[PDB]
Symmetry: C2
């Protein structure tokens, strides 16, 4: 890489994107409040986007240079997260009006954060194009910050990372590695470094048991788990992993009238997206129960689905035998990646024992670390992959989140195939489709004699 | 901003830099091990560099877009720091040979980190151009990582941030703000959120007292403070704030044969740089004593200065009267920014009482948040400043480090002038010079009747 060749590559990638936007009369992205929040899903546009992010980031890295690389990174980067911590806990997104500016004096008063400290936090926020200072003394939104107005799912994602993942797990991972080595046991995690025998706490136990707090309509026991469920929904409502991508990566219409057991769990928000598009499907969403789960699940269903039975909650232990009969599809999105091989095999064997091989299939959605195949219309590394690819990087972030919190791990295509064949040697991978811009693939599995 | 106008601005900035490199037969930066570690200090080149970093980063931010902004940031960013934590604690920089590749198998064995976990850490490192995978199965250095080989100062900066600043202070700043409000008291910091009365610990008390560890030649009591002193030296040896910039921002030769009391403290590494350049100066470096400080100070002096008396340590309480007579210069680099107004005024009055107004001056070096004046040859915002400027961002990182650890703060030019005039109304700011590429200014103060 040289600064000149990176600049030339940037111009080529920009020209692909800009030409497509102009040809199709599409809005140009900006940092204004009402900028589009994404670029078109056209595969060639998304390839250019993924390459542009990588090449622009590489050029900034090269221009910073090696002398300022660690000097600046270890100074600044952790404060981007601390700034978000303040913005979420003081509800600054909602306190700044969407379409107007607000003085620091008025903003400070609205949120109860002394103005001199507010000013020092906002100064750092602006450097990530998160809010802006349109005139001296005043604060306004940007594209990036306005999209989080009135969005508890986005606030959940900030706070889960800054108040739980980073302090309890990531910042203890070196010590956990030294204490237990490289294991897949979710007890071998930061909260347990000094735990007395038999008193180890699992992440999911802390999530479901802590009662000292409230989040987004759940007060007391399990508020942190409810907030975690909100983070899962955040990844479905928009952005790279949005749930509507599944409609492009798998043909739900080919199932006709069919029963889907959705072992993705959580609140069934992906089942709801598919159900709205395909009224002949019934989704039975299976998840470990919590006192508030059935009520919250039902309250969050799209209005059109409430009371219809098309998407319904069924409390279930995913490690136990399957009670639903005549299931056409076992569906599980971003669920098996939390399961080391033996636990994943238990789940998959309970599904297989409940499958009619001639009629049933398993549809999974997970990272394939090497890459899924693009959708047929869209057919050294694919854009976004390779050592500096932005999808390589997102996959690594998710993989390290699985490591830090659970000792779980992401898998390659061959890893998935081997896992399923160990569960039942009759499993065949029929399709592994990843839309350009997304890190997950939708995989279709059948039992063949 | 649009993607096209950012791309055009990138091409203009690259052309300035590339034309200068070619005209002067200078090496092109790359990610290779032996890339230059910085660009020329020519002011127009550095202005173009600072603008290029900002514009490239803005273009990557825009191409990511608002939908993936928080989704990706809160996933990935904290892992850049966790990766550094591993790289430093397992000494991966030194274990990868500078000029050769090493297999993951051999690297894992050298450092005692299981290979599967090593591979998952390196995957994330590569996305910041920190090491690379030149062939499948093998690891090599990049420009960015090779510069940290055999550099305990760089390792100190990683570990101080990831093991002390972030967990003990930054990740508790919201809670500290809620407990105490906006104060300048260094007791009102994260370690003391639950401290019992009169048992509060100051950062600098923890640094100097903890004896459960070792760092870079200091075993036991005060190892963390020694590591902090190494971080201070790291900012002097290279990069934006390198100490040789002071030779451009102030004329030490005009002093002739002169005595300088250096209240920067630490290990006098900036005094050593000036002393090597100006043999007629004597520097008396004043700092709070520690058992190991005089020995380490003397061992780290440049060979040419050892035993010469040109740079010597004098234990001193900066809040106490000044014992040295006939001082020509009181020098203090990045020291007063840790001092709230009343404490800074105490120091400055002790200096002023020891000054002959006709002969003496104070030379300070600190951030001026609005910007110092460029050196005379180099004469809405200056490059690097403004809301997304990279020097604005570094200043904010340092300002938030001062907030989180000490409740201290950075200052504008007018803040500095007001502070000095409160200390003694005879103080006049004669010069405030900031070299392009650096965040600190060198300020010259005299007493005028």
């Amino acid at each position: 890489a040289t600064i000149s060749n990176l600049a030339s590559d940037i111009q080529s990638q920009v020209d692909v994107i800009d030409s497509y936007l102009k040809k199709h009369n599409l809005q140009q992205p900006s940092f204004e409040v009402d900028s589009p929040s994404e670029l078109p899903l056209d595969a060639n546009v998304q390839r250019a986007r993924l390459k542009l992010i990588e090449t622009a980031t590489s050029l900034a890295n090269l221009a910073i240079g090696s002398a300022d690389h660690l000097r600046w990174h270890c100074m600044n980067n952790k404060y981007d997260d601390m700034v978000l911590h303040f913005l979420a806990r003081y509800n600054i997104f909602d306190a700044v009006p969407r379409n107007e500016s607000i003085s620091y004096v008025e903003l400070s008063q609205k949120i109860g954060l002394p103005e001199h400290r507010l000013r020092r936090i906002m100064s750092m926020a602006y450097t990530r194009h998160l809010f802006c200072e349109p005139k001296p003394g005043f604060v306004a939104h940007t594209s990036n910050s306005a999209l989080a107005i009135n969005d508890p799912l986005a606030m959940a994602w900030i706070l889960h990372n800054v108040e739980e993942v980073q302090p309890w797990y990531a910042n203890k991972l070196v010590d956990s590695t030294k204490k237990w080595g490289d294991t897949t046991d979710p007890r071998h995690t930061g909260p347990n470094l000094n735990a007395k025998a038999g008193e180890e706490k699992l992440f999911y136990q802390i999530m479901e048991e802590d009662d000292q707090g409230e989040w987004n309509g759940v007060k007391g026991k399990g508020f942190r788990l409810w907030r975690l469920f909100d983070t899962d929904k955040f990844f479905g409502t928009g952005g790279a992993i949005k749930g509507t991508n599944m409609l492009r990566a798998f043909d739900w219409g080919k199932l006709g009238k069919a029963t889907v057991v959705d072992l993705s769990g959580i609140t069934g928000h992906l089942s709801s997206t598919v159900a709205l598009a395909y009224p002949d499907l019934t989704f039975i969403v299976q998840e470990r129960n919590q006192s508030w789960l059935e009520k919250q699940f039902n309250d969050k269903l799209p209005a059109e689905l409430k009371g219809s039975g098309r998407v319904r909650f069924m409390a279930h232990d995913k490690y136990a035998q399957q009670p639903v009969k005549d299931v056409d599809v076992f569906f599980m999105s971003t669920m098996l990646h939390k399961e080391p091989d033996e636990k994943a095999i238990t789940i998959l064997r309970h599904c297989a024992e409940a499958m009619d091989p001639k009629k049933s299939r398993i549809v999974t959605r997970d990272i394939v670390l090497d890459g899924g195949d693009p959708p047929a219309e869209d057919a050294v590394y694919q854009a976004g992959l390779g050592p500096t690819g932005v999808i390589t990087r997102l996959n690594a972030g998710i993989d390290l989140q699985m490591l830090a919190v659970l000792n779980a791990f992401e898998r390659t295509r061959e890893d998935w195939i081997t896992l399923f064949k160990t569960a039942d040697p009759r499993f065949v991978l029929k399709a592994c489709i990843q839309t350009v811009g997304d890190c997950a693939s939708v995989m279709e599995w059948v039992l063949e004699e």
